[PDB]
Amino acid sequence: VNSFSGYLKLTDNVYIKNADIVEEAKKVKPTVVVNAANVYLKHGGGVAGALNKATNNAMQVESDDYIATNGPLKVGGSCVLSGHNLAKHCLHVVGPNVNKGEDIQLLKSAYENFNQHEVLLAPLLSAGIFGADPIHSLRVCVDTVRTNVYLAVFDKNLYDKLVSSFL
Ligand SMILES: OC[C@H](CC1OCCO1)Nc1ncnc2[nH]ccc12
Ligand SMILES: [Cl-]
């Protein structure tokens, strides 16, 4: 039993809800919140920009130190950093950004990072400003993640379409 409330069960372990991931994280304070990161951990917009804003830019400061030490992430890769005031940890995961010409097959590799954590609050990878088909992102999530994932979808119109089109 966990404190995630109001989710629709798509599968044994995949759940979905229309919610602002920032407001969800602030309410639940999950062990792991997933960020829709880029390889430079530059959290300028989308989910990443909103999560970083909610930390008063502390996420960006920590991320800049991480990059200075370790260099960029790989597309499909991840790193674990602090969750600041939002969660215990933030799993920064880089899905392919279609608007940069990155291979959509890497979306499965990106979701595989979730399997290293028993429970996560997450957005749909490569959706939104990363330019992939969100119905596809949900399909890959359900077919790749085996741990318990609570998916937050900000756009209500999109949420209804994902549910009604889910197989
Ligand atoms: O796949 C990422 C989704 C994309 C979907 O389509 C257009 C907007 O929402 N973005 C978000 N999902 C959850 N919380 C969020 N906070 C800020 C952005 C955001
Ligand atoms: Cl987005």
Q: Is the CB of 62 under 6 A from ligand 1?
A: no
Q: Is residue 13 part of a domain?
A: yes
**If we measure between CA atoms, which residue out of 51, 38, 34 comes closest to residue 113?**
34
H/E stretch holding 79: strand 78-82
Residue with tokens 């920064």: 92
Q: Is the CB of 23 under 6 A from ligand 1?
A: no
Written as one string, the DSSP assignment of 40-78 is T----SHHHHHHHHHTTTHHHHHHHHHHHHH-PPPTT-E
Q: How is residue 109 written in tokens?
A: 């590799």
Of ligand 1's atoms, which has the minimum distance to the CA of residue 128?
A: 4
Give the number of domains in the chain.
1
What separation in angstroms does the CA of 49 have from each of 2, 8, 28, 78, 119? 27, 26, 20, 17, 23
Can you give the CATH number for the domain in which 98 is found?
3.40.220.10
Q: Is residue 148 part of a domain?
A: yes
Resolution for the entry shown, Å:
1.0
Q: Is residue 140 part of a domain?
A: yes
In sequence order, which residues have a C-beta less than 8 Å from that of residue 155 and are 6 or more positions away?
A: 18
Ligand nearest to the CA of 126: 1
Q: What's the one-letter identity of residue 115?
A: N
Angle at 51 (CA atoms; ends 53, 127), nearest 5 degrees: 130
| Domain carrying residue 57 | 8-163
Residue with tokens 């608007």: 99
Q: Is residue 155 part of a domain?
A: yes
Written as one string, the DSSP assignment of 94-135 is ----GGGT--TTHHHHHHHGGGGSSEEEEPPTT-GGG---HH
Q: Is residue 2 part of a domain?
A: no
Q: Is residue 1 part of a domain?
A: no
Sign of the dihedral defined by the CA atoms of residues 153, 156, 158, 162, in that order: positive
Q: Is the CB of 48 under 6 A from ligand 1?
A: no
Q: What's the one-letter identity of residue 109?
A: S
Asked if 43 contacts 127 with a C-beta cutoff of 8 angstroms, the reply is no
Quickly count: other Cβ atoms within 10 Å of residue 97's Cβ.
Answer: 19
